[PDB]
mmCIF file of all heavy atoms in Angstrom:
data_model
loop_
_atom_site.group_PDB
_atom_site.id
_atom_site.type_symbol
_atom_site.label_atom_id
_atom_site.label_comp_id
_atom_site.label_asym_id
_atom_site.label_seq_id
_atom_site.Cartn_x
_atom_site.Cartn_y
_atom_site.Cartn_z
ATOM 1 N N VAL A 84 -33.120 59.883 -18.099
ATOM 2 C CA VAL A 84 -33.561 61.265 -18.251
ATOM 3 C C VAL A 84 -35.025 61.323 -18.663
ATOM 4 O O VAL A 84 -35.760 62.224 -18.242
ATOM 5 C CB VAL A 84 -32.655 62.021 -19.239
ATOM 6 C CG1 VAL A 84 -32.851 61.514 -20.650
ATOM 7 C CG2 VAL A 84 -32.921 63.512 -19.170
ATOM 8 N N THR A 85 -35.485 60.369 -19.467
ATOM 9 C CA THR A 85 -36.859 60.394 -19.942
ATOM 10 C C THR A 85 -37.821 59.707 -18.985
ATOM 11 O O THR A 85 -38.979 60.123 -18.872
ATOM 12 C CB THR A 85 -36.935 59.733 -21.320
ATOM 13 O OG1 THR A 85 -36.098 60.448 -22.233
ATOM 14 C CG2 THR A 85 -38.355 59.744 -21.851
ATOM 15 N N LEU A 86 -37.365 58.673 -18.285
ATOM 16 C CA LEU A 86 -38.201 57.880 -17.401
ATOM 17 C C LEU A 86 -37.741 57.933 -15.955
ATOM 18 O O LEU A 86 -38.547 58.175 -15.059
ATOM 19 C CB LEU A 86 -38.225 56.424 -17.878
ATOM 20 C CG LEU A 86 -38.639 56.196 -19.327
ATOM 21 C CD1 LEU A 86 -38.901 54.728 -19.576
ATOM 22 C CD2 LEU A 86 -39.864 57.021 -19.649
ATOM 23 N N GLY A 87 -36.456 57.714 -15.702
ATOM 24 C CA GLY A 87 -35.961 57.664 -14.342
ATOM 25 C C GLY A 87 -35.962 56.251 -13.801
ATOM 26 O O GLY A 87 -36.938 55.522 -13.985
ATOM 27 N N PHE A 88 -34.890 55.857 -13.124
ATOM 28 C CA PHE A 88 -34.735 54.491 -12.651
ATOM 29 C C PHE A 88 -35.239 54.345 -11.226
ATOM 30 O O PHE A 88 -35.089 55.253 -10.399
ATOM 31 C CB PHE A 88 -33.282 54.045 -12.712
ATOM 32 C CG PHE A 88 -32.736 53.976 -14.090
ATOM 33 C CD1 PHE A 88 -32.050 55.037 -14.627
ATOM 34 C CD2 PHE A 88 -32.891 52.839 -14.843
ATOM 35 C CE1 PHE A 88 -31.540 54.967 -15.890
ATOM 36 C CE2 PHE A 88 -32.392 52.772 -16.113
ATOM 37 C CZ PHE A 88 -31.711 53.832 -16.635
ATOM 38 N N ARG A 89 -35.822 53.183 -10.949
ATOM 39 C CA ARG A 89 -36.352 52.829 -9.644
ATOM 40 C C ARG A 89 -36.003 51.379 -9.362
ATOM 41 O O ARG A 89 -36.167 50.518 -10.226
ATOM 42 C CB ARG A 89 -37.868 53.017 -9.598
ATOM 43 C CG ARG A 89 -38.491 52.662 -8.279
ATOM 44 C CD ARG A 89 -40.004 52.643 -8.381
ATOM 45 N NE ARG A 89 -40.572 53.965 -8.623
ATOM 46 C CZ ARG A 89 -41.279 54.284 -9.702
ATOM 47 N NH1 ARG A 89 -41.506 53.373 -10.637
ATOM 48 N NH2 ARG A 89 -41.765 55.509 -9.844
ATOM 49 N N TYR A 90 -35.512 51.119 -8.160
ATOM 50 C CA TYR A 90 -35.192 49.774 -7.708
ATOM 51 C C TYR A 90 -36.046 49.465 -6.491
ATOM 52 O O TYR A 90 -36.428 50.373 -5.750
ATOM 53 C CB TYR A 90 -33.710 49.635 -7.362
ATOM 54 C CG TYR A 90 -32.816 49.387 -8.553
ATOM 55 C CD1 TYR A 90 -33.139 49.881 -9.802
ATOM 56 C CD2 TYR A 90 -31.647 48.666 -8.425
ATOM 57 C CE1 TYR A 90 -32.330 49.660 -10.885
ATOM 58 C CE2 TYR A 90 -30.833 48.443 -9.505
ATOM 59 C CZ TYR A 90 -31.179 48.943 -10.731
ATOM 60 O OH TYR A 90 -30.370 48.720 -11.812
ATOM 61 N N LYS A 91 -36.353 48.191 -6.285
ATOM 62 C CA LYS A 91 -37.239 47.773 -5.208
ATOM 63 C C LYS A 91 -36.588 46.639 -4.437
ATOM 64 O O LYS A 91 -36.073 45.691 -5.037
ATOM 65 C CB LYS A 91 -38.596 47.351 -5.762
ATOM 66 C CG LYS A 91 -39.243 48.399 -6.657
ATOM 67 C CD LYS A 91 -40.625 47.976 -7.129
ATOM 68 C CE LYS A 91 -41.341 49.118 -7.830
ATOM 69 N NZ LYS A 91 -40.629 49.532 -9.063
ATOM 70 N N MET A 92 -36.609 46.741 -3.113
ATOM 71 C CA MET A 92 -35.904 45.807 -2.246
ATOM 72 C C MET A 92 -36.853 45.188 -1.242
ATOM 73 O O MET A 92 -37.591 45.904 -0.563
ATOM 74 C CB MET A 92 -34.795 46.496 -1.477
ATOM 75 C CG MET A 92 -33.506 46.516 -2.190
ATOM 76 S SD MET A 92 -32.578 47.898 -1.567
ATOM 77 C CE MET A 92 -31.623 48.211 -3.012
ATOM 78 N N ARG A 93 -36.802 43.875 -1.121
ATOM 79 C CA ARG A 93 -37.521 43.190 -0.066
ATOM 80 C C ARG A 93 -36.530 42.480 0.842
ATOM 81 O O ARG A 93 -35.613 41.802 0.384
ATOM 82 C CB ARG A 93 -38.522 42.206 -0.661
ATOM 83 C CG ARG A 93 -39.305 42.798 -1.816
ATOM 84 C CD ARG A 93 -40.331 41.821 -2.353
ATOM 85 N NE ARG A 93 -41.180 41.257 -1.305
ATOM 86 C CZ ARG A 93 -41.863 41.956 -0.400
ATOM 87 N NH1 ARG A 93 -41.859 43.280 -0.399
ATOM 88 N NH2 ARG A 93 -42.585 41.315 0.503
ATOM 89 N N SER A 94 -36.720 42.651 2.146
ATOM 90 C CA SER A 94 -35.772 42.162 3.143
ATOM 91 C C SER A 94 -36.318 40.880 3.751
ATOM 92 O O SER A 94 -37.292 40.911 4.504
ATOM 93 C CB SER A 94 -35.530 43.202 4.223
ATOM 94 O OG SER A 94 -36.521 43.119 5.225
ATOM 95 N N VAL A 95 -35.678 39.756 3.445
ATOM 96 C CA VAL A 95 -36.114 38.488 4.007
ATOM 97 C C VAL A 95 -35.711 38.432 5.471
ATOM 98 O O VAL A 95 -34.689 39.001 5.871
ATOM 99 C CB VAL A 95 -35.524 37.317 3.214
ATOM 100 C CG1 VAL A 95 -34.032 37.259 3.407
ATOM 101 C CG2 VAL A 95 -36.171 36.011 3.628
ATOM 102 N N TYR A 96 -36.528 37.768 6.281
ATOM 103 C CA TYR A 96 -36.240 37.608 7.696
ATOM 104 C C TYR A 96 -36.964 36.372 8.201
ATOM 105 O O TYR A 96 -38.013 35.990 7.682
ATOM 106 C CB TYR A 96 -36.655 38.839 8.502
ATOM 107 C CG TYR A 96 -38.137 39.102 8.477
ATOM 108 C CD1 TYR A 96 -38.912 38.906 9.604
ATOM 109 C CD2 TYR A 96 -38.764 39.535 7.319
ATOM 110 C CE1 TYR A 96 -40.263 39.143 9.584
ATOM 111 C CE2 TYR A 96 -40.115 39.773 7.287
ATOM 112 C CZ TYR A 96 -40.859 39.575 8.421
ATOM 113 O OH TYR A 96 -42.211 39.811 8.392
ATOM 114 N N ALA A 97 -36.399 35.756 9.236
ATOM 115 C CA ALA A 97 -37.000 34.554 9.796
ATOM 116 C C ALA A 97 -37.582 34.819 11.173
ATOM 117 O O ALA A 97 -38.786 34.666 11.388
ATOM 118 C CB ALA A 97 -35.970 33.427 9.878
ATOM 119 N N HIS A 98 -36.739 35.250 12.101
ATOM 120 C CA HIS A 98 -37.177 35.471 13.470
ATOM 121 C C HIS A 98 -36.818 36.868 13.955
ATOM 122 O O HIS A 98 -37.177 37.232 15.079
ATOM 123 C CB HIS A 98 -36.560 34.407 14.386
ATOM 124 C CG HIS A 98 -36.989 34.505 15.814
ATOM 125 N ND1 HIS A 98 -36.104 34.392 16.862
ATOM 126 C CD2 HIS A 98 -38.206 34.705 16.368
ATOM 127 C CE1 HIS A 98 -36.755 34.524 18.002
ATOM 128 N NE2 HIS A 98 -38.033 34.715 17.730
ATOM 129 N N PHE A 99 -36.163 37.668 13.141
ATOM 130 C CA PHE A 99 -35.736 39.006 13.544
ATOM 131 C C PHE A 99 -36.195 39.975 12.474
ATOM 132 O O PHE A 99 -35.497 40.189 11.471
ATOM 133 C CB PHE A 99 -34.225 39.071 13.734
ATOM 134 C CG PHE A 99 -33.756 38.412 14.985
ATOM 135 C CD1 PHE A 99 -33.278 37.119 14.957
ATOM 136 C CD2 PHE A 99 -33.804 39.076 16.191
ATOM 137 C CE1 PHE A 99 -32.847 36.506 16.102
ATOM 138 C CE2 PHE A 99 -33.380 38.464 17.342
ATOM 139 C CZ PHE A 99 -32.896 37.181 17.296
ATOM 140 N N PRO A 100 -37.357 40.577 12.642
ATOM 141 C CA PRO A 100 -37.899 41.440 11.589
ATOM 142 C C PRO A 100 -37.012 42.635 11.313
ATOM 143 O O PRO A 100 -36.856 43.510 12.167
ATOM 144 C CB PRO A 100 -39.257 41.870 12.154
ATOM 145 C CG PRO A 100 -39.145 41.664 13.623
ATOM 146 C CD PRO A 100 -38.251 40.486 13.803
ATOM 147 N N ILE A 101 -36.429 42.668 10.114
ATOM 148 C CA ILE A 101 -35.548 43.761 9.721
ATOM 149 C C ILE A 101 -36.250 45.085 9.966
ATOM 150 O O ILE A 101 -37.335 45.339 9.430
ATOM 151 C CB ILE A 101 -35.137 43.616 8.255
ATOM 152 C CG1 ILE A 101 -34.110 42.504 8.103
ATOM 153 C CG2 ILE A 101 -34.557 44.907 7.745
ATOM 154 C CD1 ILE A 101 -32.793 42.832 8.735
ATOM 155 N N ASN A 102 -35.641 45.933 10.784
ATOM 156 C CA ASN A 102 -36.181 47.254 11.071
ATOM 157 C C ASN A 102 -35.350 48.272 10.309
ATOM 158 O O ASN A 102 -34.277 48.681 10.766
ATOM 159 C CB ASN A 102 -36.185 47.535 12.568
ATOM 160 C CG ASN A 102 -37.298 46.808 13.281
ATOM 161 O OD1 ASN A 102 -38.295 46.428 12.667
ATOM 162 N ND2 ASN A 102 -37.133 46.600 14.581
ATOM 163 N N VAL A 103 -35.842 48.662 9.142
ATOM 164 C CA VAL A 103 -35.202 49.662 8.305
ATOM 165 C C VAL A 103 -36.056 50.917 8.321
ATOM 166 O O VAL A 103 -37.270 50.859 8.097
ATOM 167 C CB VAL A 103 -34.989 49.147 6.871
ATOM 168 C CG1 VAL A 103 -36.290 48.669 6.268
ATOM 169 C CG2 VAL A 103 -34.417 50.249 6.018
ATOM 170 N N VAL A 104 -35.430 52.043 8.626
ATOM 171 C CA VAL A 104 -36.093 53.339 8.600
ATOM 172 C C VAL A 104 -35.132 54.289 7.901
ATOM 173 O O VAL A 104 -33.955 53.963 7.730
ATOM 174 C CB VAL A 104 -36.471 53.798 10.026
ATOM 175 C CG1 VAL A 104 -37.099 55.180 10.026
ATOM 176 C CG2 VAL A 104 -37.413 52.798 10.672
ATOM 177 N N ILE A 105 -35.627 55.424 7.425
ATOM 178 C CA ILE A 105 -34.765 56.312 6.662
ATOM 179 C C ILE A 105 -34.410 57.526 7.509
ATOM 180 O O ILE A 105 -35.182 58.487 7.570
ATOM 181 C CB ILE A 105 -35.451 56.716 5.355
ATOM 182 C CG1 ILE A 105 -35.949 55.465 4.651
ATOM 183 C CG2 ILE A 105 -34.466 57.369 4.441
ATOM 184 C CD1 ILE A 105 -36.954 55.752 3.577
ATOM 185 N N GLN A 106 -33.235 57.498 8.158
ATOM 186 C CA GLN A 106 -32.978 58.428 9.254
ATOM 187 C C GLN A 106 -33.091 59.874 8.810
ATOM 188 O O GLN A 106 -33.760 60.674 9.470
ATOM 189 C CB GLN A 106 -31.600 58.161 9.852
ATOM 190 C CG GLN A 106 -31.269 59.018 11.062
ATOM 191 C CD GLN A 106 -29.864 58.774 11.582
ATOM 192 O OE1 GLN A 106 -29.571 57.717 12.141
ATOM 193 N NE2 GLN A 106 -28.988 59.756 11.400
ATOM 194 N N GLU A 107 -32.459 60.228 7.706
ATOM 195 C CA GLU A 107 -32.713 61.504 7.069
ATOM 196 C C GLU A 107 -33.609 61.235 5.869
ATOM 197 O O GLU A 107 -33.803 60.087 5.470
ATOM 198 C CB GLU A 107 -31.402 62.193 6.672
ATOM 199 C CG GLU A 107 -31.522 63.693 6.496
ATOM 200 C CD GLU A 107 -31.965 64.065 5.110
ATOM 201 O OE1 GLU A 107 -31.855 63.201 4.217
ATOM 202 O OE2 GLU A 107 -32.458 65.195 4.917
ATOM 203 N N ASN A 108 -34.187 62.291 5.305
ATOM 204 C CA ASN A 108 -35.195 62.105 4.271
ATOM 205 C C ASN A 108 -34.648 61.387 3.037
ATOM 206 O O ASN A 108 -35.096 60.283 2.714
ATOM 207 C CB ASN A 108 -35.846 63.457 3.915
ATOM 208 C CG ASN A 108 -34.887 64.453 3.258
ATOM 209 O OD1 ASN A 108 -33.824 64.097 2.765
ATOM 210 N ND2 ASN A 108 -35.274 65.719 3.263
#
């Protein structure tokens, strides 16, 4: 309530670049 939580994600990939998009906002 005072600060708010935030998480951060990194997607590992070797030969297939992870294509993540946010379909709705």
Side-chain angles (χ1 to χ4, degrees):
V84 69
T85 300
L86 306 192
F88 295 94
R89 180 190 293 119
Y90 278 30
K91 307 183 171 63
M92 271 155 208
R93 315 182 51 52
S94 85
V95 68
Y96 64 110
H98 182 224
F99 285 97
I101 286 292
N102 284 338
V103 55
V104 177
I105 310 164
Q106 184 183 290
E107 202 274 343
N108 66 17

